[PDB]
Design a protein around this ligand. Sequence first.
Ligand SMILES: *Cc1cc2c(cc1C)Nc1c([nH]c(=O)[nH]c1=O)N2C[C@H](O)[C@H](O)[C@H](O)COP(=O)(O)OP(=O)(O)OC[C@H]1O[C@@H](n2cnc3c(N)ncnc32)[C@H](O)[C@@H]1O
Ligand SMILES: *Cc1cc2c(cc1C)Nc1c([nH]c(=O)[nH]c1=O)N2C[C@H](O)[C@H](O)[C@H](O)COP(=O)(O)OP(=O)(O)OC[C@H]1O[C@@H](n2cnc3c(N)ncnc32)[C@H](O)[C@@H]1O
Ligand SMILES: *Cc1cc2c(cc1C)Nc1c([nH]c(=O)[nH]c1=O)N2C[C@H](O)[C@H](O)[C@H](O)COP(=O)(O)OP(=O)(O)OC[C@H]1O[C@@H](n2cnc3c(N)ncnc32)[C@H](O)[C@@H]1O
Ligand SMILES: OC[C@H]1O[C@@H](O)[C@H](F)[C@@H](O)[C@H]1O
Ligand SMILES: OC[C@H]1O[C@@H](O)[C@H](F)[C@@H](O)[C@H]1O
Ligand SMILES: OC[C@H]1O[C@@H](O)[C@H](F)[C@@H](O)[C@H]1O
Lengths: 86, 90, 572, 569
Amino acid sequence: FSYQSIDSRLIVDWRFFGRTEPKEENKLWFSDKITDAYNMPQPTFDFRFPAGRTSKEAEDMMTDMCVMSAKIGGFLPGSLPQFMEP
Amino acid sequence: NTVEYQKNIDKFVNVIQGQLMSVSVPVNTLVVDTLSPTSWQASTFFVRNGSNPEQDPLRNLSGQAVTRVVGGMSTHWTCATPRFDREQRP
Amino acid sequence: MDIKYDVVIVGSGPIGCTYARELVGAGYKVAMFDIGEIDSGLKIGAHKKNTVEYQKNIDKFVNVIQGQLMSVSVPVNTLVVDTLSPTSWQASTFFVRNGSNPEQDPLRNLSGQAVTRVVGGMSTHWTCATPRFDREQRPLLVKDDADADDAEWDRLYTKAESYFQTGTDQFKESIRHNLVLNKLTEEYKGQRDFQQIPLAATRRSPTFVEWSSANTVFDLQNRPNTDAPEERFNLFPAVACERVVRNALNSEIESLHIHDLISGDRFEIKADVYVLTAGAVHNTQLLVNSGFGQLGRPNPANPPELLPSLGSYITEQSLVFCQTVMSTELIDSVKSDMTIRGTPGELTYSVTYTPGASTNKHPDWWNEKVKNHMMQHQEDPLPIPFEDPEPQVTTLFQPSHPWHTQIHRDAFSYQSIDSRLIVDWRFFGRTEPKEENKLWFSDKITDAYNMPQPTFDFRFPAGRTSKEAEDMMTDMCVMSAKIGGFLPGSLPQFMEPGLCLHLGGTHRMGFDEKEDNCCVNTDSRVFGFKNLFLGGCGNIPTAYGANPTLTAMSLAIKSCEYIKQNFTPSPF
Amino acid sequence: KYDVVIVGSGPIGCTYARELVGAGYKVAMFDIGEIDSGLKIGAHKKNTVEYQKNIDKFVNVIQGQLMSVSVPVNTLVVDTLSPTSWQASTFFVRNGSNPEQDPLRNLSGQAVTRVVGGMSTHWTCATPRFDREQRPLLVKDDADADDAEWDRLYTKAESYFQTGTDQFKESIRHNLVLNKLTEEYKGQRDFQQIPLAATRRSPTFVEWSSANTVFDLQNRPNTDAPEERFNLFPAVACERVVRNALNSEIESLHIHDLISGDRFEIKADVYVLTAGAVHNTQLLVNSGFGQLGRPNPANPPELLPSLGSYITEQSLVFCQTVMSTELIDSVKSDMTIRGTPGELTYSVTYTPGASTNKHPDWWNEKVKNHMMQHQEDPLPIPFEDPEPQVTTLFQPSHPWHTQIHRDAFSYQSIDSRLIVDWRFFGRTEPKEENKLWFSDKITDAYNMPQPTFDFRFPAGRTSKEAEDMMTDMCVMSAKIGGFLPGSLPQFMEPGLCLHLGGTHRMGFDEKEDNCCVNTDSRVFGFKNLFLGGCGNIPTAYGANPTLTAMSLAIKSCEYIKQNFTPSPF
Ligand SMILES: *Cc1cc2c(cc1C)Nc1c([nH]c(=O)[nH]c1=O)N2C[C@H](O)[C@H](O)[C@H](O)COP(=O)(O)OP(=O)(O)OC[C@H]1O[C@@H](n2cnc3c(N)ncnc32)[C@H](O)[C@@H]1O
Ligand SMILES: *Cc1cc2c(cc1C)Nc1c([nH]c(=O)[nH]c1=O)N2C[C@H](O)[C@H](O)[C@H](O)COP(=O)(O)OP(=O)(O)OC[C@H]1O[C@@H](n2cnc3c(N)ncnc32)[C@H](O)[C@@H]1O
Ligand SMILES: *Cc1cc2c(cc1C)Nc1c([nH]c(=O)[nH]c1=O)N2C[C@H](O)[C@H](O)[C@H](O)COP(=O)(O)OP(=O)(O)OC[C@H]1O[C@@H](n2cnc3c(N)ncnc32)[C@H](O)[C@@H]1O
Ligand SMILES: OC[C@H]1O[C@@H](O)[C@H](F)[C@@H](O)[C@H]1O
Ligand SMILES: OC[C@H]1O[C@@H](O)[C@H](F)[C@@H](O)[C@H]1O
Ligand SMILES: OC[C@H]1O[C@@H](O)[C@H](F)[C@@H](O)[C@H]1O
C-alpha cells in the first residue's frame, strides 16, 4: 500500500504509529436523515487528536522517524516525512 | 497469494485501493471556474457524488474506509501481528 | 510639488500618457500621479521586455508578468488541509485569511482579473497587439451617419497607431510566421483572410524588437527640459489618489485628495481639469470612494442618485487557449526546394538550391536561411533556423466568426518539445453587456491601500455570449488542426475568467446617460460635471472580442480635443 | 583610457568603485546587463510599496532573473503527440541545453543574474560573519592579528551594507520563535536576529540594502561629487583580458557593446573582475588562463592550474512549519478573556506594567487591540506583524548555518501568520575533482564558452554533515510546530542556494595552497589584475558568503591604493 526511477532494492518504507487517548468527545455517529449505499444510516465522525499527551507524542514520533531513518539513508524525493490522512 | 502479484508487487496497491470505500466524505467545495459558458454550472456547493452533508470536513477521519468482500480486510492486509505490552492493553 | 495645475491625470498607463502627450503638447501645466513606482530603467514607463537579456531568454519574461499581476478579488479559501501535525494550530472554520475577500461569491467571480501598479501600468509588460474594431464591436461616435462614423474612427485610430508605432510587417522575415500564415490562407481560401497581428513595436535587428509602451506615447520626463523648454509636466510616483471632491451641486470637481506613500502625508491638489486613467477597476473604485454610484452590496431598493450605471454592464471576454506542435508536412515543406546529398555529418553532405529557379516554392532569402542552417548545424534535425522570430498571425473578428484570434507566441505562458515547433492559439469572445454583471466595492472590507475592496458579481450571459463562446472553442479546435496536433499539457481549454485582462464597461460611454445606461459622453466627460474625464477600457460599452487598448486610446484622443477647445492653458 | 576598469556592477564591483572613486581614481565600470531598478541605479527591487504590500509576488521577480548556468539535454518522453505532429527520433540538443553536461553531476539549481546591481537587486540580505573555522587566513601563524584584520574589514563591510540586528525586534512572530528556541536548547546554542543589510523605514516598510547602498552608480563628476570620476556602461559584454607575453600584466579589456554591436579594446592601469563566481571564471578561461574544454590531465594548464577546480557549493535543506497551538496560546497568556467573540459581553484585558506579565506592554496592547477590534479573527497575532528573522550561527558542534524566517524566494490555505521557513546550509570540503569548466565548442547566449559542471558533494565529512544537518532541522523545527503539507523536509536542487565559491580561489602560495589569487586578491604573477567575489573564498563555509567577499574586496582596494597612483583630475 504505497501512498519508479530509483532502484527498488534501495528503497525502505518507514511507518510509525501513535497511540490515541480515548476521549468521550471523539465520536462515530449515524445520520437520522442521510443514508449510505446500502440505505443504512450514514456514518459521521467528530474527531480530533486529543491535545496533551496524544499530540505531544505524535510530534515526538515524527521526530523519531526522522532521526532513526537517517541512520539508513536520506529521504526518497516524493516520499518525504509526513502525517498521513487521519 | 497469486504468482502474478508476487512477480509484480507494485500493482497490488491497486487491489487495495479498489476495495477501500471511504466512510464519510464531506461536501466538496473545490472551485471549477473554467467550465465552458454553455455547461450547466452550480450556484452552490450542493450535496453531490455520495458526500455526507453532516460531516464537518475539519473534524473528520477522511482516510477511514471499509471493505465489503468475503474475508473482509484480511484479503488485502499487510499481516503484521504484534502483541500489545501491558501499557497498550485492557 | 505645487498646489495648483491646469490638468491632473491619475495613472501613468498608456491612456494616461495619451492625455499627457496631447495636453503637455498643447501648453497645459500638467501633473500626473501614479500609485506605483518607476522601475523600467531610465526610460520611464518603458516595456520591460526591451532588454537584451530578456530577448535572449524569452521564456523567463512570464515571471515578470506574474510578479506584477495582483489579483482583484480572491474568495475565502476552503481547501481542507487535514495532514497537519496534531501539535500545529488548526482552524475550526474557513475564516478570512491571507487577503481574501469575504464578500466574493467564488462561483460568480472574475478570478483571473488582476491589476498592475507600476509607472507605465500594464504597458510595461503587455503583448502589444493593437487591432481596430470593426463596426460590429465599436460604439457609435456619430449617430445616423455611418460614413461619418467610420471617418471619425479612421481619423482617431490612425493617430492612435502613430502614437503606439503600430505596424504589420515587423515579423515578415520569420520562416515560422510565414509557414503558418500561408498554410491558413490556403486552407480557408475565399472564406477567411489572415494577416500579421497589428503590433505596437519597432524592429531594431533580426533578433531585437523595441516593444511599445506608455513611454513610446509619452516619455514621462519632467518638463521643462532641454528638449521641451516651453512644456510643463511633473510625474509623482508612489502617490495613492483616493478621492475627487464634488461640489454640493455635483457639477464640478473641486480637488483631488492624494496620499504620499513614502512620507505618509495626505494633500489636496487643485486643477482646472481632472482625468482619471487608473484602469477599469481602479477608476471605478476611485469614483465610488468619492460618492458616485453606490458603495456596498448592490441594493435595487435604494438606487444611487449619481451615475447609477457605474459598475454595471461590465464585460469581460471568454478566452480559449491551446498550443500545437507543427505538422511533419509543414516542417518538410520548409525545405521543399533543397537538393540533399549524403547524410548529415559526412564530409560530402550537401544541401543546395538554385537561386531564381522558377520551380522554387520559396523566395531566395528563405532558401538561403534554410540551406545555411542545415549546413552549419548538421547535428540539428529541423530546417528552421535557431534565431527565427515567432509567428504573429490573426484572422480578425467577422460576423461569421465573431471572435478575435491570435496564432502566435506570447510571453505569458499559462520544455521537452523543440520551441521552433510550438504555436500558441488564443481566441477571444465578445460579451453582451448586462445590467446584472457588476463590479462593486465593500463598505466594510478594504484592500492593501485601505480602499473599498473590489467585488465581482459576474457570469457570462446565456444566449448569444455563451453559444458563441462554445462555437469559438470548436473553431480553435478545427483551425489549429490545420497546423499540427495539440501540445500535451496545453490542451484546449477555457482560461480563468478575467485572465485575458480585457475588462470593459465599468464606466461606460454613450450619448445619453439614461437611454444608453452610461456614465460618460463621447468626449469621455462624466455626465453633469464640467471638468471630469475618464479614460480607458472602462469607457467601452459594446461587446468586443479584439484587444481594447487601441480603441481606448482613440477615445482619449477625442477627449483631449474637447479639453483643448474648452479650457485655457495658464501662461508659463 | 581609465585608471581602473571594473567588470560587473554587483555589490562586490560596487565595493571597488566605492573605495577607488572615493580615493580619486578615474574609474569605468561595465555590466553586461541593463539598468532596471528605477532611478536608484542597482537598488533592491523589493523596495517598492507595492512589493512590501504583496510580498508573495516577489518570488516571481527573482525567478524572472535567474538564468540557469547549465541545463542538460532533456530526455522526457512525450508519446501522446498527434500522429500528424513532427516527432523526434532522438533526444537531440533542444531549447538551449548543454550537450557537455552530465545530468547526474550537475549543479542544476545554479543560475546567474544579468542586471545592473547583479543579484543584490533581489537577494535576502543576510550578512553574517564567518567564524574562524569557516574563514580563510589573512595572516598565518598569528590568530590574534588574523582576528584583528578580519574584525576591521568586516566592520567596514557592515557599514557599507548597513547591516543591523535590531530591525525585527518588534515582531511578535519573531520573538515567539526566538524565545521558544532559546528556552529549549538550555544554553547549548545561542539564537539571535539574522544580521540583515537593511534599514527599517516604518512598521510596514524595510529599505533592503543592495549594490546601490554600497555605491550609488551615478556618473561622476556630479554636483554631489564634483571631484570624483566614474562612468557606468551597461549592456556591455566583457569578453577577454589581454595578457602580455610575460604573463606579468594585463594590457587591455576587450568588450562587445550589445546595443550598437561594436567591439572595443579598453585600456586601464588596473583591471578588476567582479562578474560573479561563474562569469569571472568564464572570462579568465576565455583569456587563456586555466584550461579550455573538457578537463584533460595529460595537458596540464600553464597559467592558474587551480582555476575552476576545488569548487564548493553548499547543501541546502528546507521545510516550512505551522506554529504550534501552545505557542499561539502563549501570545495571549497575559490577557484576561471573558465571553465569546462577537457578542456584547466579550472583553480582553491585561494589567499594564505588571511584574508577573510574560510580555511587555507594547506586545499586550497590540494583542488586546487585535483581539477586540477583529473579533472575527481567531488568532491573537496582529495582521501586519513583521516576519521572523532568527538564526543560530554555525558552531563546531552544529557546523551549518541556519535561517528561521520568511524568504521571498519560496520553493495559501494556512494563515500566513502561522508559517515559518527553515533553511539550513552545509559546508562543502574543497576537492580538486569538483570542477566548473567551459566547452571548446558549445557557446552560451552571449557567444562565450558554455559553462559545464562536474560536481558531487564529497563523500566523508561533507556528506555526513549534510545528513546530520537535515536531522537537526527536523529536530529543531518540531519545537515550533509541525511541517506544512507541501513544504516537507527536503534537500534542494544542487546550487539553488547560489553560494558557489572557490572557482578562483585565494591562498598564500599558488602551488602549496592550490590557488589563483593572493590575500590582496591579486592574480599570481600579474601586477594589475584583481578578482573579487565569492569565487575567491577557498574554505568550506556554510554561512552566506557575500559579506566575507566584500571584506576581501576592501583589503584588495587597500593594496591598490598603496601601489597605483590616480591620474590627476
Ligand atoms: C486494508 C488494510 C488493512 C490492514 C492492513 C493494511 C491495509 C491496507 N495491515 C494490517 C491490518 N491489521 C493488522 O493487525 N495488521 C496489519 O498489518 N489491517 C487491518 C485488518 O485487516 C483489520 O483490522 C481486520 O481485518 C478486521 O477484522 P474484522 O473485525 O474481522 O473486520 P473486517 O473489516 O475484516 O471484516 C468485516 C466484514 O463484515 C462485513 N460487513 C460489514 N457490514 C456488514 C453488514 N451490515 N452485514 C453483513 N456483513 C457486513 C464486511 O463485508 C466484511 O467482510
Ligand atoms: C498584463 C497584460 C496586459 C495586456 C496584454 C498582456 C498582458 C499579460 N496584452 C495586450 C493588452 N492590451 C491590448 O490592447 N493588447 C495586448 O496585446 N493588455 C492590456 C493593456 O496593457 C491595458 O488594456 C492597458 O495598459 C490599459 O491602459 P490604462 O487604461 O492606461 O491602464 P493601466 O492599468 O495600464 O494603467 C493604470 C495605472 O493607474 C495606476 N493606479 C491605479 N490606481 C491608482 C490610484 N488610486 N492612484 C493613482 N494611480 C493609480 C496604476 O498603478 C497604473 O499604472
Ligand atoms: C538571487 C539570490 C541571491 C542571494 C540571496 C537570495 C537570492 C534568491 N540571498 C543572499 C545572498 N547572499 C548573501 O550573502 N546573503 C543572502 O541573504 N545571495 C547571493 C548574493 O546576491 C551574491 O553572492 C552577490 O550578489 C554576489 O555579488 P557579486 O560578486 O558582485 O556578483 P553578482 O552576481 O551580484 O554581480 C555580477 C555582475 O556581473 C555581471 N556580468 C556577468 N558577466 C559579465 C560579463 N562578461 N561582462 C560584464 N558584466 C558581467 C552581471 O550582469 C552582474 O550584474
Ligand atoms: O492573458 C492576457 C492576454 O492579454 C491579451 O491582450 C493578449 F493578446 C494575450 O495574448 C494575453 O497575453
Ligand atoms: O511591564 C510588564 C512586564 O513585561 C515583561 O516583559 C517583563 F519581563 C517584566 O519584567 C515586566 O516589565
Ligand atoms: O536560494 C537562495 C538562498 O540564498 C541564501 O543566501 C538566502 F539566505 C536563502 O534565504 C535563499 O534565498
